[PDB]
C-alpha cells in the first residue's frame, strides 16, 4: 500500500519536466531577442563612431 | 519574461532511467539561460544626437542613420514550441490519471485483503481447511502428489 502511495506522489509531481521544457524554450527565445537588439545597436553605433573617429 | 517556479531533484524523482542525460542536459541549458539573461539588461541604452549632431561633419548622416534606427523593426522571435509541449503534458496527465485510478482500485483491494487477514479466527479454533483458505500456500498440491502424504518426504 505504501509503495503504491509513493508511486502516486511521484506521478503527481510529474509535470515539472514539461514546465522545464517550457522555461527553457522561453528563456532561449528571450535571450535570442535581446541578443539581436544588442547586435544591431552595437553595430550601428560602430558605424557612427567609425565616422566620428575618422 | 514570466517564468515558472522550479524544484530540481523533485524534477529528478520523476525522470525515468532512459533519459537522465537528456534531463540534466536540459538542466544545464536552463542554467546557461539563467546566467545569460541575468547578465545583460532588458533594453539597449538609447543614444543622444546632441553628441552625434555636434560631432559628425557629414551632411545629416547622423539624422538619417538614426532615423533608420528609430524606424527599424527588429524581428521578434516567436515561440512555435510551447503549445506542443503543453499538449504533450495534457496527454501525459491523462495517461497517468488513469494509471493512478487503476492503482487506487488496487489500493482498496489490498486493504480489503488486509481486513480479511486481520479478521482471522484464532488459530486454536481453525480447521486445516480454514487455514488453507486463509494461507492458500499451505494447500497440499493434490496434483503433483496424489498419494499420501501429498508432499515430498523431505518436507514431511
Amino acid at each position: 500500500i505504501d509503495t503504491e502511495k509513493s508511486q502516486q506522489a511521484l506521478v503527481q509531481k510529474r509535470h515539472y519536466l514539461f514546465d522545464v521544457q517550457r522555461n527553457n524554450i522561453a528563456m532561449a527565445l528571450e535571450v535570442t531577442y535581446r541578443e539581436r537588439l544588442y547586435r544591431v545597436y552595437k553595430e550601428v553605433k560602430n558605424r557612427l563612431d567609425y565616422h566620428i573617429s575618422v | 519574461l514570466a517564468l515558472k517556479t522550479i524544484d530540481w531533484v523533485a524534477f529528478a524523482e520523476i525522470i525515468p532511467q532512459n533519459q537522465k542525460a537528456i534531463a540534466s542536459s536540459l538542466k544545464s541549458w536552463n542554467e546557461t539561460l539563467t546566467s545569460r539573461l541575468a547578465a545583460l539588461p532588458e533594453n539597449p541604452p538609447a543614444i543622444d544626437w546632441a553628441y552625434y549632431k555636434a560631432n559628425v561633419a557629414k551632411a545629416g548622416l547622423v539624422d538619417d542613420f538614426e532615423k533608420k534606427f528609430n524606424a527599424l523593426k527588429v524581428p521578434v522571435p516567436e515561440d512555435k514550441y510551447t503549445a506542443q509541449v503543453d499538449a504533450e503534458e495534457k496527454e501525459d496527465v491523462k495517461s497517468c490519471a488513469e494509471w493512478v485510478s487503476l492503482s487506487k482500485a488496487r489500493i482498496v483491494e489490498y486493504e480489503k485483503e488486509m481486513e480479511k487477514m486481520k479478521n482471522l479466527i484464532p488459530f486454536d479454533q481453525m480447521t486445516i481447511e480454514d487455514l488453507n483458505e486463509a494461507f492458500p500456500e499451505t494447500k497440499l498440491d493434490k496434483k503433483k502428489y496424489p498419494y499420501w502424504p501429498h508432499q515430498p518426504i523431505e518436507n514431511l
Side-chain angles (χ1 to χ4, degrees), chain A, chain B residues 1-67 69-79 81-156:
Chain A
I1 285 181
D2 291 342
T3 298
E4 295 292 298
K5 288 203 185 312
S6 68
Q7 304 307 93
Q8 298 196 190
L10 304 194
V11 78
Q12 183 57 40
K13 278 175 189 166
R14 186 52 177 169
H15 69 86
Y16 288 164
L17 160 66
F18 308 106
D19 63 51
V20 169
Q21 298 198 14
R22 268 197 291 282
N23 286 124
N24 272 40
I25 286 159
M27 296 196 81
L29 61 91
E30 171 58 70
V31 162
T32 56
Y33 176 57
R34 278 191 212 172
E35 283 192 28
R36 306 182 207 190
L37 258 187
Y38 287 147
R39 169 173 264 190
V40 58
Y41 170 99
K42 167 190 62 64
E43 196 276 332
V44 294
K45 194 191 188 185
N46 184 29
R47 286 173 188 252
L48 195 142
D49 62 21
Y50 156 90
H51 279 336
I52 280 177
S53 178
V54 66
Chain B
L1 189 85
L3 287 193
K4 287 305 205 71
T5 301
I6 184 173
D7 191 345
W8 264 121
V9 73
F11 153 78
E13 299 174 331
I14 64 177
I15 180 73
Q17 312 88 68
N18 71 315
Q19 41 188 344
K20 290 294 301 176
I22 289 166
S24 41
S25 70
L26 298 180
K27 182 163 191 161
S28 84
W29 265 108
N30 181 276
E31 315 291 358
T32 71
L33 306 193
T34 63
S35 79
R36 201 178 284 184
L37 194 149
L40 53 87
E42 194 271 334
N43 44 11
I47 47 191
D48 213 318
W49 293 1
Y51 186 60
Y52 297 150
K53 182 179 181 59
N55 192 357
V56 64
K58 283 85 170 192
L61 178 140
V62 54
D63 208 299
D64 66 359
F65 274 1
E66 192 82 8
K67 198 184 66 174
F69 168 78
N70 57 61
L72 173 69
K73 180 264 307 175
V74 67
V76 183
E78 59 88 19
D79 310 337
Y81 288 101
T82 55
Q84 65 180 21
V85 310
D86 295 359
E88 158 66 42
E89 184 192 275
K90 296 146 169 262
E91 179 258 0
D92 197 75
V93 159
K94 179 265 300 178
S95 158
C96 274
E98 55 86 5
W99 189 98
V100 77
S101 64
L102 154 75
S103 280
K104 287 194 90 182
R106 295 146 102 197
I107 298 177
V108 73
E109 166 172 33
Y110 290 178
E111 211 160 21
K112 163 180 71 71
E113 188 68 19
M114 181 186 293
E115 291 305 329
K116 164 156 81 62
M117 294 274 166
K118 187 55 73 170
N119 295 143
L120 272 196
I121 56 183
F123 291 101
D124 75 90
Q125 283 89 333
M126 202 171 317
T127 187
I128 282 188
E129 307 286 344
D130 302 355
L131 171 72
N132 280 317
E133 278 311 316
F135 284 83
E137 68 198 5
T138 80
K139 266 284 189 188
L140 288 88
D141 184 349
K142 299 260 182 57
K143 184 151 308 308
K144 208 198 307 190
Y145 313 97
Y147 310 105
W148 192 85
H150 308 309
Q151 53 188 352
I153 312 294
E154 294 82 5
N155 304 325
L156 186 49

